[PDB]
Amino acid sequence: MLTLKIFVYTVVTFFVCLFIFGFLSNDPARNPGK
Amino acid sequence: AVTPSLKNFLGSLIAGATVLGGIALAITAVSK
Amino acid sequence: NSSLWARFCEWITSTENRLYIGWFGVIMIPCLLTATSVFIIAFIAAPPVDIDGIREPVSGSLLYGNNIITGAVIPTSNAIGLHFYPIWEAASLDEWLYNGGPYQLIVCHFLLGVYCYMGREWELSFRLGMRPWIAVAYSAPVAAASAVFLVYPIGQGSFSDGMPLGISGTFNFMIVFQAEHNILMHPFHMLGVAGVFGGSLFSAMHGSLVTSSLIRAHGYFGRLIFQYASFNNSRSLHFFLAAWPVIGIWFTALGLSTMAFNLNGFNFNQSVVDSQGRVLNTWADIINRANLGMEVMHERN
Amino acid sequence: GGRDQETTGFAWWSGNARLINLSGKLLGAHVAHAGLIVFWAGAMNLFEVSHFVPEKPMYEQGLILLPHIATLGYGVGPGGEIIDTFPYFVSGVLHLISSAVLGFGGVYHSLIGPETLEESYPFFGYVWKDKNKMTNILGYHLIMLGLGAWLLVWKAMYFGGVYDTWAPGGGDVRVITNPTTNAAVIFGYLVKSPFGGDGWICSVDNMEDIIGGHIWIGTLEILGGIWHIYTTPWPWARRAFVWSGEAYLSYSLGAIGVMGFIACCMSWFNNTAYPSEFYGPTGPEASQSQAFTFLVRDQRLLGKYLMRSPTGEIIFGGETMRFWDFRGPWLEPLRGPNGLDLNKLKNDIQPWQERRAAEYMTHAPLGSLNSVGGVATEINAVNFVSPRSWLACSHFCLGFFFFIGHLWHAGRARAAAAGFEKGIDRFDEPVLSMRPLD
Amino acid sequence: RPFSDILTSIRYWVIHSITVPALFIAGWLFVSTGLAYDVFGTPRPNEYFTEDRQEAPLITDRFNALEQVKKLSGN
Amino acid sequence: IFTVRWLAIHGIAVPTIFFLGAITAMQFIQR
Amino acid sequence: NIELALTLVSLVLVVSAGPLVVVLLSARGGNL
Amino acid sequence: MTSILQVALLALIFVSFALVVGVPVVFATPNGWTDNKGAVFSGLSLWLLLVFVVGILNSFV
Amino acid sequence: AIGTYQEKRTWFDDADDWLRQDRFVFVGWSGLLLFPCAYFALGGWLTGTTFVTSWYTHGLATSYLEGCNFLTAAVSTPANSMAHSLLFVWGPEAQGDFTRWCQLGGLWAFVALHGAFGLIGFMLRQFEIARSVNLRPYNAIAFSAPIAVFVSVFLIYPLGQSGWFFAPSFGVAAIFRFILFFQGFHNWTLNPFHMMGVAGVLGAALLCAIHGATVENTLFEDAEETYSMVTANRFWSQIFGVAFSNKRWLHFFMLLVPVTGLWMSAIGVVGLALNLRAYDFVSQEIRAAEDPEFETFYTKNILLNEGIRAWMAAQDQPHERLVFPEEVLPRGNAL
Amino acid sequence: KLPEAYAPFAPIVDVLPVIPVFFILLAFVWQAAVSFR
Amino acid sequence: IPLWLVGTVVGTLAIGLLAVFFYGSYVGLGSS
Numbered sequence A: 001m002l003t004l005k006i007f008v009y010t011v012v013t014f015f016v017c018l019f020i021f022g023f024l025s026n027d028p029a030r031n032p033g034k
Numbered sequence B: 001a002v003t004p005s006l007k008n009f010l011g012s013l014i015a016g017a018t019v020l021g022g023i024a025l026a027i028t029a030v031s032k
Numbered sequence C: 001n002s003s004l005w006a007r008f009c010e011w012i013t014s015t016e017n018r019l020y021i022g023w024f025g026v027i028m029i030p031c032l033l034t035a036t037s038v039f040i041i042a043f044i045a046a047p048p049v050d051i052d053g054i055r056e057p058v059s060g061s062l063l064y065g066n067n068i069i070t071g072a073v074i075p076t077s078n079a080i081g082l083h084f085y086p087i088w089e090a091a092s093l094d095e096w097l098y099n100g101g102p103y104q105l106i107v108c109h110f111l112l113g114v115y116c117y118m119g120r121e122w123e124l125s126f127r128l129g130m131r132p133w134i135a136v137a138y139s140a141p142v143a144a145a146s147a148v149f150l151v152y153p154i155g156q157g158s159f160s161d162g163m164p165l166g167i168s169g170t171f172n173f174m175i176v177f178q179a180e181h182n183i184l185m186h187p188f189h190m191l192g193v194a195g196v197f198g199g200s201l202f203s204a205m206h207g208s209l210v211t212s213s214l215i216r217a218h219g220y221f222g223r224l225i226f227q228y229a230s231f232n233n234s235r236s237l238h239f240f241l242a243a244w245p246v247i248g249i250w251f252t253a254l255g256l257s258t259m260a261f262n263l264n265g266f267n268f269n270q271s272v273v274d275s276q277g278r279v280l281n282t283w284a285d286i287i288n289r290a291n292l293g294m295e296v297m298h299e300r301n
Numbered sequence D: 001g002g003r004d005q006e007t008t009g010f011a012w013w014s015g016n017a018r019l020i021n022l023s024g025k026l027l028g029a030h031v032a033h034a035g036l037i038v039f040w041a042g043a044m045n046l047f048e049v050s051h052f053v054p055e056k057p058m059y060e061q062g063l064i065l066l067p068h069i070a071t072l073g074y075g076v077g078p079g080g081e082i083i084d085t086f087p088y089f090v091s092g093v094l095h096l097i098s099s100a101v102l103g104f105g106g107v108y109h110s111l112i113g114p115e116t117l118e119e120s121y122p123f124f125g126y127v128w129k130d131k132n133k134m135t136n137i138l139g140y141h142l143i144m145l146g147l148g149a150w151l152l153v154w155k156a157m158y159f160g161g162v163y164d165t166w167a168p169g170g171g172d173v174r175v176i177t178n179p180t181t182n183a184a185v186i187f188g189y190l191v192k193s194p195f196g197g198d199g200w201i202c203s204v205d206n207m208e209d210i211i212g213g214h215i216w217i218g219t220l221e222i223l224g225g226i227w228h229i230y231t232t233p234w235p236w237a238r239r240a241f242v243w244s245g246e247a248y249l250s251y252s253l254g255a256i257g258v259m260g261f262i263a264c265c266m267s268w269f270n271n272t273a274y275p276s277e278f279y280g281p282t283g284p285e286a287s288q289s290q291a292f293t294f295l296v297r298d299q300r301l302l303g304k305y306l307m308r309s310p311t312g313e314i315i316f317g318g319e320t321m322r323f324w325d326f327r328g329p330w331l332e333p334l335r336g337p338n339g340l341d342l343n344k345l346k347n348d349i350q351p352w353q354e355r356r357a358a359e360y361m362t363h364a365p366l367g368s369l370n371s372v373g374g375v376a377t378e379i380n381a382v383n384f385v386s387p388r389s390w391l392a393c394s395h396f397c398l399g400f401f402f403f404i405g406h407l408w409h410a411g412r413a414r415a416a417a418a419g420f421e422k423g424i425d426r427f428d429e430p431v432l433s434m435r436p437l438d
Numbered sequence E: 001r002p003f004s005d006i007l008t009s010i011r012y013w014v015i016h017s018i019t020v021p022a023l024f025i026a027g028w029l030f031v032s033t034g035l036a037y038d039v040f041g042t043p044r045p046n047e048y049f050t051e052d053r054q055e056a057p058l059i060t061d062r063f064n065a066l067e068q069v070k071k072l073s074g075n
Numbered sequence F: 001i002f003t004v005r006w007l008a009i010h011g012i013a014v015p016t017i018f019f020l021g022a023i024t025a026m027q028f029i030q031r
Numbered sequence G: 001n002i003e004l005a006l007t008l009v010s011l012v013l014v015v016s017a018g019p020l021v022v023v024l025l026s027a028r029g030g031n032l
Numbered sequence H: 001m002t003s004i005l006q007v008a009l010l011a012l013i014f015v016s017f018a019l020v021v022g023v024p025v026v027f028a029t030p031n032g033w034t035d036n037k038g039a040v041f042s043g044l045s046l047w048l049l050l051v052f053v054v055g056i057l058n059s060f061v
Numbered sequence I: 001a002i003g004t005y006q007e008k009r010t011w012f013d014d015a016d017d018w019l020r021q022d023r024f025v026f027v028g029w030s031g032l033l034l035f036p037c038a039y040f041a042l043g044g045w046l047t048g049t050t051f052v053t054s055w056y057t058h059g060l061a062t063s064y065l066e067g068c069n070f071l072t073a074a075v076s077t078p079a080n081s082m083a084h085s086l087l088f089v090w091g092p093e094a095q096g097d098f099t100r101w102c103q104l105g106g107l108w109a110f111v112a113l114h115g116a117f118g119l120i121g122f123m124l125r126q127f128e129i130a131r132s133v134n135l136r137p138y139n140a141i142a143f144s145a146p147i148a149v150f151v152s153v154f155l156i157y158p159l160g161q162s163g164w165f166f167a168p169s170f171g172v173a174a175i176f177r178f179i180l181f182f183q184g185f186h187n188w189t190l191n192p193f194h195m196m197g198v199a200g201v202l203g204a205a206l207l208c209a210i211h212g213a214t215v216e217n218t219l220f221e222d223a224e225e226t227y228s229m230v231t232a233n234r235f236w237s238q239i240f241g242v243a244f245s246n247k248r249w250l251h252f253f254m255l256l257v258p259v260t261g262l263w264m265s266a267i268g269v270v271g272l273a274l275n276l277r278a279y280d281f282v283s284q285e286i287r288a289a290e291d292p293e294f295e296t297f298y299t300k301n302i303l304l305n306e307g308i309r310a311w312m313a314a315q316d317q318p319h320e321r322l323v324f325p326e327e328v329l330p331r332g333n334a335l
Numbered sequence J: 001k002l003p004e005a006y007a008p009f010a011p012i013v014d015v016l017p018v019i020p021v022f023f024i025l026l027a028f029v030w031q032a033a034v035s036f037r
Numbered sequence K: 001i002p003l004w005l006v007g008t009v010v011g012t013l014a015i016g017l018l019a020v021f022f023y024g025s026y027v028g029l030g031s032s
C-alpha cells in the first residue's frame, strides 16, 4: 500500500509539474498589430 | 327533448351554431 | 516541458493531433482515463458496498446480478463520511472496495478531468483565435456535476449522499433528495427546469426556423408571436440560446449546493387553514405525503 | 457625461466597461461601491439590533452581523450571554456614518472631478500596463490589510479580548496572551487536506491559533506591501501574467471566489471563529448533540448510542457516525484519547453541557426558504433556519458566481491581450493556416 | 398608433384614469363582498366543514352529482 | 379605434386588471 | 399601526429619493 | 436629554435627505459645482456637525 | 375579379383577404380556432387558480381565494366519480349551473379541451404563416412534439385511466404531485421511453447552449454568415471529436433531438395510460426475494415507490376511501 | 431592540437595508432616462 | 410624459403589488 501511495504521489507530482511548467512555457498573450 | 340531457345538448348545439354565425357575420362585416 | 529540444512541449501544444491535448489536457487525459477505467471496472465487477455503515452490502456490479440500468458504482460508505479514502488507507483492497472507495476515486478524478476540460476549451479557444467563453457555457454542467458529486457530500457530511454513478442509482438519489429537501418546490430547481425546457424549446425553434429559412425567418416569427422577436439579429439570438440553458443550469446547480447545507425547497405544509384552525389540504401537502413516504422508506436503518 | 455606445464600443448592459481607462471615474465608482458595502453593514447591524432580543440566542433570531460583532467579545458575557447591546448599535451607526462619507466621496471622482487623473495627480494615476504603479497600489492595499489583521490582533490581545468558545465552562471573552506564532503549526493548517478529518484551515480549534495566524498574515502582508511598493515584477512574472485591468479583475475574481467557497465551508463547519453560541450549532454539531442528549436521557432512566470508528475510536452510533469528526467545546471535556470514554460520560457530564446539547438539538440547521425549520416533511410549526445555513448557501452561490466571473473575464482578458476580443479576423484565420485533417 | 406614441400621449392616461381604477375597485368589491364565493362556489373560511360533514367532501354519484354537491356544501 | 389590436389588448387587460384587483383584495382577507 | 404608517412613509420617501434626482437632472441642467 | 436628541436626529434625517437630493444634482448639472461650492460644503459641514452633536447628546443620555 | 382563372369574387375571398392582412397580429383562418380557444383556456386557468375551489373534487383548497399562492394554486381535475365526462355546462351533471359546474371540477375539462383546440389552432397558425411567406413549415412539425405530449399526458392518459381525476391539474404544485404520482405508481423514471425523452430534452438543452456559445464565440470581426463554420468545426473536432460540417444538418439536428425526445415520452405515457409500464425487472425481483441480503439501487427504488404509493394514496385518491392503519404503512425501519 | 433614545426611529431602520437594491434599480432607471445610450 | 418615467412608475407599482402579495403570503390566509 505504501508503494502504491508513493507511486501515485510521484505520478501526480510529475503531471502537475508538467502542467505548471507548460503554462510557464507558453508565450505571453500579445497583439501583433497595435 | 325526450330527456333533459337531449334538450340540453340540442340547446348547446343551437348556441354553438349561433356563436359560429355571429363570428361569421362579424368577419363578413369587418371585411369591408 | 523542454524535453528533447522542447519536442514534448511542441507536441502537447501541437494542434495537428486529432484530439488537441493541450497543457490542461496533460491533467485531463490521465485523470479522465483513470476515472473511466476505474468506473468501467467497478461497474463490470466490484464487490457490494455498504453505502451506509449498517453493514447492508448494496451491490451495483454487473457480475453481481445487475443490468446496465440497475448497475451503478455505489457511493462511499457512510462510515468513511467525508474522509479521504484512497487505496493506500484501506487495510486491504477488499476492504477498500467494500467501503466504496472506487466512488471517491472516480469522483475526484472525474471532477479534475471536467475542470481541465473547461481549461482545454479555453486553450483551443485561444489557439484558434476566437472568443473564449465556451468554457463559461460548459461551466454549467460542470457546476451541476460538482454540486451532485462534491458539494452535496460536503454539506451532508458524507460521500454516501453523493449521486451514485448509475441510472437506477441516479433515480434513487433523486427520489431521496426530493424526500429530504423538496427539490421540486425550490425556486432554483424550478428555474433550472425552466432553463432546460426553454433550452429544448429554443433548440427546436432555432432548428425549425433555420431549416425552413435555408431555401438555398424574422417575418415568420414576428407574425407568429404577438410581441415579435427582440433578437432580430442572429448574434443576439445565439447569445440568448447560450444564456438561457446555461444560467438555468447554473441556478439549479446552485440550488442543489444550497440544499447541501440544509436549505430545502418551499414548505407550504398547512399553509391554508379553516376558521376553526383545521388544516385544509392542498397540492403542497400531498407532495408532503409523498415526501413522507420516500423519507420513511429511505431510512432502512 | 456618461458617453454612449458609439464613442466607447460598450453598450449600457456593459456600461461599467467604459470605466476601464477612466481612472478617476473608476475610482469614484469603487469608492461609491465601498460606501454601498459599508451602508449595508451599518443598515443591517441596526436592523438586527432593532430586531434583537438579548434573552434569546442570536441564531434563534436569524442574525448574521450580531454574531460577527459578538465573536469579537463586544457586549457578550460568559456562556454566550449578552451583557448589553450598545456595542452592536454603535458599530452599526459608525458604519452608517462612514458609509455616508464614503458615498459622498464616491459620488465625487465620478459625477464631477478628474475623469482621468493620470496627469493632474501623478501619484494616484495608473495605467494598467504600468506594472510598477499597479504593484504600488497593490502594496498600499497589502499594507492596509496587514494593518487590519494587526488591528484584530490588538483587539484580541491588548483589548477586552475575543470571544473564546473553548474556555472552560462554555465560553467567554478571553484575552489572548500567547498566540501560537509557531510557523510549523500555522502552516500545517494549509498543508492539511481539505477532506474529512484534517479539514484544512476550517479545522482551527482554538483562538490561540487564529490570533497567531493573524499575526503571521499581518506581518507577511506588511512585508509584501513594502516589497511591492519598492519592486517591479520579475521577468517570469511579467511573462506569466496578462497585464491589463480586466486581467487583474480576473485574478481578483478567481481568488475571491475561492475565498467565498472557503467562507462557505468554514461557516458551515468551523465553530471557533463561528461560535455555535451565536451562529447556532454546526450540522455535525447538531447531529452529535442530538445523539449525546439521547444518550444522557436514556442513561438517566452503551451499545445503543456508541460504536467503534473505522480508525478505532469510540464514536456516537447511528446515522450521526459520519459526523464523528465534530469537536465541540461541550463535548471535548468528556472525550478521552480513545474517542469518547464511558467513565467521563458517566460522571464528567455537567448540567450546562446537557442544556447546550438539548438547545443545539432543537435548533438544527435544517430549514427551508420559507424560514421554516425542520425537515421538508415537517408541518409549519416553527420559524427557524440557522444563520450557518444562510451564510453557507449565500456565500457558496456568490463564490461560484465569482469563479464563473473569473472564467469570463480571464477569457476576455486573454482575448484582448491577443487581439481576439473583436472576433476572428475575416481576411485570414488561424484555422485556415492549419492542415484540413483535424 | 405605435406603443411609444399611444402611451406617451396624455389622451390614453386621461381616458384610462377613470377606467383602470374602476376595474380595480370592481374586483375589490367582487372579492370583499363575497360575491366570488357565491358565484364560483368557493366555500368561505367558516364553511369548509359543516355540522353534518366534518371531513373532506366526496362526490360519488356521476349523474346525480348536482344534488350531491348541493348537500355536501352549505346548501 | 376598435381595431383587432385594440380588441386583443383590451381582452387581455380588462380581465387582468379585474383579477389583479380581486387578488389584492383577497390579500387582506379575513383569517 | 402608527409604526407601519411611518415605515410606509419612510419607504416611499426612499423610493422617491432617486427618481427625484433623475427627474431633476432631466429637467434642470439636462446633464443626467 | 431624550427629546432634544430626538429633534436633533430628526433634523439630521431631513438634512441628509436634502443632501441626497441636492449633492448629486449640484454635481452633475452643468456649471453646478462651480458657484455653489460654498453651499454644498456648508451643507456637508452642517451635516457633520449635527452628527457630532447628536453623538454628544447620546453620550449625555 | 381575382382568382385562378377569372373567378368571380365571393364572400370567401373577402374573408380570406381580411383575415390575412399584415396588421399588428396575424389572425388568419386558423386564428378563428386559436384565439377563442387559447384565450378561453388561459382565462379558465386563471379563474380557476383565482376563485374556483377543489374542495368538492379532490378535497383540497387550491386557489388564490382560498389562500393558496402561485405555486400551490391549480385547476384541479374533476372527481373520479365523473369518470371521463367532458363536464359541459349543459351536461347531465351541473345542468347549466355555472357555480356547481365549477364545483364539480368541470373548469379543468373546460381548460383542457379549449387548450387542446388552441394548440391545434396554433399549429394551424404555424402552417398558415409558413405558407404566407413561402417557407417550409418545420416549426409546425416541431410543435407536433408538444402537442403530442399534451395529448398523451392530459387527454390519452386520463382516458386510459379511470377518469379525468388522474390527469395533471393545471398548477405548479399539482404538476409536481402528478410527477411524484408517476414516480410512485408507474416507476416512470425506469420507463425506457421516459429515459429516451429525458435524454432528448437534456441533449436539446446541450445543443442550445453549445450552439449559442460557439456561434457567439466564432463570430467574425466587424447576405454572408456572421460566424466561422470552419473554426467551430475544428474546435469541436479537436476538443470533443465530432463536429458539424454543415449548418443545415446542424440546425436540423437541433430540431430533431427535442422533437424525438418528446415523441418518445408521449409514446411512453401512452403506454402508462394502460398501466403498461416497465416497472420491474422480474429477475431482480426474484433474486431479492430469494436472497434477503441481496440489495441494489433498483430494489431501493421499488421500495421508495411502494412508500410513495402507500403514504400518498390516502389523500391523493379520496374516492378509494383508503384508511391505512399505522401498522401497515410501509416504513424503512420495518424492513 | 434599539436604545431607548432611538426607540421611535425603529421604522426607518426597518427600510434601511433594502436601499442597495434601490441603488441598482436607480442605475437601471437612470439608464432608461438616458434612453440606453 | 416621458416614456422612461412611465416605465419607472409601472415598475414601482408592480413591485408594490408583489410586495403586497408576499406580505399576504406572510399574514392572513395561506400564512398558517
Ligand code: CLA
Pocket: D027, D031, D101, D102, D104, D105, D106, D108, D109, D113, D114, D117, D121, D124
Ligand atoms: C481610496 C479612495 C480615494 C482615493 C484614491 C482618492 C483620491 C483622490 N481624491 Mg478623493 N475622496 C475619497 C476617497 C478617495 N480619494 C473619499 C472617501 C472622500 C470623501 C471624504 C473624498 C473626497 C475628495 C475631495 C472633496 C477631493 C478629493 C481629491 C482627491 C485627489 C487628491 C487627494 C489628496 O492627495 O489629498 C490627500 C489629503 C490628505 C490630507 C490625506 C488624508 C489621509 C487621512 C489619514 C485619512 C484617513 C486614511 C486612512 C488610511 C484610514 C482609512 C479609512 C478606512 C478604514 C475607510 C485624489 C485623486 C481632491 C481632488 O481631486 O482635487 C484636488 C478633492 O478636491 N477627494
Ligand code: CLA
Pocket: D001, D002, D003, D004, D011, D012, D013, D014, D015, D016, D018, D019, D025, D026, D028, D029, D030, D032, D033, D036, D100, D103, D104, D107, D110, D111, G018, G021, G022, G025, G031, G032, H019, H020, H023, H024, H028, J023, J024, J026, J027, J028, J030, J031
Ligand atoms: C453600484 C454600482 C455602480 C457604480 C458605483 C457605478 C458607477 C458609475 N457608472 Mg455604472 N452601472 C451600474 C452600476 C454602477 N455604476 C449598473 C448596474 C449599470 C447597468 C444599468 C450601469 C451602467 C452604466 C453605464 C451605461 C454607464 C455607467 C457609468 C458610470 C459612471 C457615471 C459617470 C457619470 O458622469 O455619471 C453619469 C450619471 C449621472 C450624471 C446621473 C447620476 C445621478 C444619480 C441618480 C445619483 C445618485 C446618487 C445617490 C443616490 C445619492 C447618495 C450620495 C449622497 C450622500 C451624496 C460611474 C463611475 C457611465 C460612465 O462613466 O461610462 C462612460 C456610463 O456610461 N454605468
Ligand code: CLA
Pocket: D012, D013, D014, D015, D016, D017, D249, D253, D394, D397, D398, D401, D402, D403, D404, D405, D406, D408, D409, D412
Ligand atoms: C469584482 C466583480 C466584478 C467586476 C468589477 C466586474 C466588472 C465588469 N464586468 Mg463582470 N462579472 C462578475 C464580476 C465582476 N464584473 C461576475 C461575478 C460575473 C459572473 C456572473 C460576471 C460576468 C460578466 C459578463 C457576462 C460580462 C461582464 C462585464 C463586465 C463589465 C461591464 C459590466 C457592467 O457594465 O455592468 C452591467 C450590470 C448589469 C447589466 C446588471 C446585472 C444585474 C444582474 C444580472 C442581476 C443580479 C441579481 C442578483 C444580485 C443575483 C444574486 C445571485 C445570488 C444567488 C448569489 C465590467 C468590466 C461585461 C463586459 O462587457 O465586460 C467587459 C459582460 O459582458 N461581467
Ligand code: CLA
Pocket: B012, B013, B014, B015, B016, B017, B019, B020, I032, I033, I036, I037, I040, I086, I087, I088, I089, I090, I106, I109, I110, I111, I113, I114, I117
Ligand atoms: C370558436 C372556437 C371555439 C371552439 C373550437 C370551442 C370548443 C369547445 N368548447 Mg368553447 N366557447 C367558445 C368558442 C369555442 N369553443 C366561445 C366563444 C364561448 C363563449 C360563449 C365558449 C364557451 C364554452 C363553454 C362555457 C363550454 C365550452 C365547451 C367547449 C367544448 C364542447 C363544445 C361542444 O361540443 O358543443 C358545441 C358544438 C357544436 C355546436 C357542434 C358544431 C357543429 C355544427 C356547426 C352544429 C350543427 C349544425 C347543423 C346544421 C344543425 C343540425 C341539426 C340537427 C340537430 C338535427 C369544445 C372543446 C364546453 C366544454 O367542454 O367545457 C368543459 C363548455 O362547458 N365552450
Ligand SMILES: C=Cc1c(C)c2cc3nc(c4c5[nH]c(cc6nc(cc1[nH]2)C(C)=C6CC)c(C)c5C(=O)[C@@H]4C(=O)OC)[C@@H](CCC(=O)OC/C=C(\C)CCC[C@H](C)CCC[C@H](C)CCCC(C)C)[C@@H]3C
Pocket: C197, C200, C201, C202, C204, C205, C208, C224, C225, I037, I038, I041, I042, I045, I111, I112, I114, I115, I116, I118, I119, I122, I126, I139, I140, I142, I143, I145, I146, I169, I170, I171, I172, I175, I201, I258, I259, I262
Ligand atoms: C413546460 C414547458 C413548455 C412551455 C410552457 C411551452 C410553451 C410554449 N411554447 C410555444 C411554442 C413552441 N414549443 C416548441 C417546442 C418545445 N416546447 C417545449 C416546452 C414548452 N413549451 C419543449 C420541451 C419543446 C421541444 C419540442 C416549439 C417548436 C414551439 C413553437 O412554435 C411555439 C413558439 O413560437 O415558441 C415561443 C408556445 C405555444 C403557443 C401558445 O401560446 O399557445 C397557444 C395555445 C394555447 C395557449 C392553448 C393551450 C393551453 C394549455 C393546455 C395550457 C392551459 C392552462 C394554463 C395556461 C397553463 C397552466 C400552467 C400550470 C401547469 C402551471 C408557448 C410559449
Ligand SMILES: CCCCCCCCCCCCCCCC(=O)OC[C@H](COP(=O)(O)OC[C@@H](O)CO)OC(=O)CCCCCCCCCCCCCCC
Pocket: B007, B008, B009, B010, B011, B012, B015, B016, B017, B019, B020, E039, I032, I033, I089, I090, I095, I096, I097, I098, I099
Ligand atoms: C352565473 C354565471 C357567471 C358568469 C361570469 C360572469 C360573466 C358573464 C359570462 C357569461 C358566460 C358564462 C358561461 C355560461 C354559464 C352558464 O350559466 O351556462 C348555462 C347554459 C346552459 O343552460 P341550460 O343547459 O339549462 O339550457 C338549456 C337550453 O335552453 C340551452 O342549452 O350554458 C350556455 O349558456 C350555453 C353554453 C355556451 C355556448 C355554447 C357552447 C359554445 C362553444 C361552441 C363551439 C362550436 C364549435 C366551433 C368550432 C370552430
Ligand SMILES: CC1=C(/C=C/C(C)=C/C=C/C(C)=C/C=C/C=C(C)/C=C/C=C(C)/C=C/C2=C(C)CCCC2(C)C)C(C)(C)CCC1
Pocket: D029, D032, D033, D035, D036, D039, D046, D093, D096, D097, D099, D100, D101, D102, D103, D104, D106, D107, D110, D111, H009, H012, H013, H016, J006, J009, J012, J013, J023, J024, J026, J027, J030
Ligand atoms: C455614482 C452613481 C451611481 C451609484 C452611486 C452610489 C452607490 C452611491 C452610494 C452612496 C451612499 C452609500 C451614500 C450613503 C449615505 C449615507 C447617509 C446619508 C447616512 C445617513 C445616516 C443617518 C441619517 C442615520 C440616522 C440614524 C442612525 C444614526 C441610527 C439610528 C436610526 C437613524 C436612522 C435615525 C449610479 C451607478 C447608481 C448611477 C450614477 C451615479
Ligand SMILES: CC1=C(/C=C/C(C)=C/C=C/C(C)=C/C=C/C=C(C)/C=C/C=C(C)/C=C/C2=C(C)CCCC2(C)C)C(C)(C)CCC1
Pocket: A020, A023, A024, D185, D186, D187, D189, D190, D201, D204, D209, D210, D211, D212, D213, D214, D217, D240, D241
Ligand atoms: C489566518 C489563518 C491561519 C493561517 C493563514 C495562512 C498560513 C495563510 C497562508 C496563505 C497562503 C500561503 C496562500 C497562498 C496562495 C497561493 C495561491 C493562490 C497560488 C496561486 C497560483 C496561481 C494562480 C498560478 C498560476 C499560474 C502558474 C501555475 C504559472 C503559469 C501561469 C499561471 C498564472 C496560470 C491560521 C490557520 C493559522 C488561523 C486561521 C486562519
Ligand SMILES: CC1=C(/C=C/C(C)=C/C=C/C(C)=C/C=C/C=C(C)/C=C/C=C(C)/C=C/C2=C(C)CCCC2(C)C)C(C)(C)CCC1
Pocket: F011, F012, F015, F016, F019, F020, I039, I040, I042, I043, I044, I046, I047, K014, K015, K018
Ligand atoms: C366566458 C367564460 C369564461 C371566461 C373567462 C376568461 C376569458 C377569463 C380571463 C381571465 C384573465 C385574462 C385573467 C388574467 C389574470 C392576470 C393576472 C392574474 C396577472 C398577474 C400578473 C402578475 C402577478 C405579474 C407579476 C410580475 C412580477 C411582479 C414580476 C415582474 C413582471 C410581472 C409583471 C410579470 C368563464 C371562465 C368565466 C366561464 C366559462 C366561459
Ligand SMILES: [Fe+2]
Pocket: C206, C210, C238, I211, I215, I251
Ligand atoms: Fe444558428
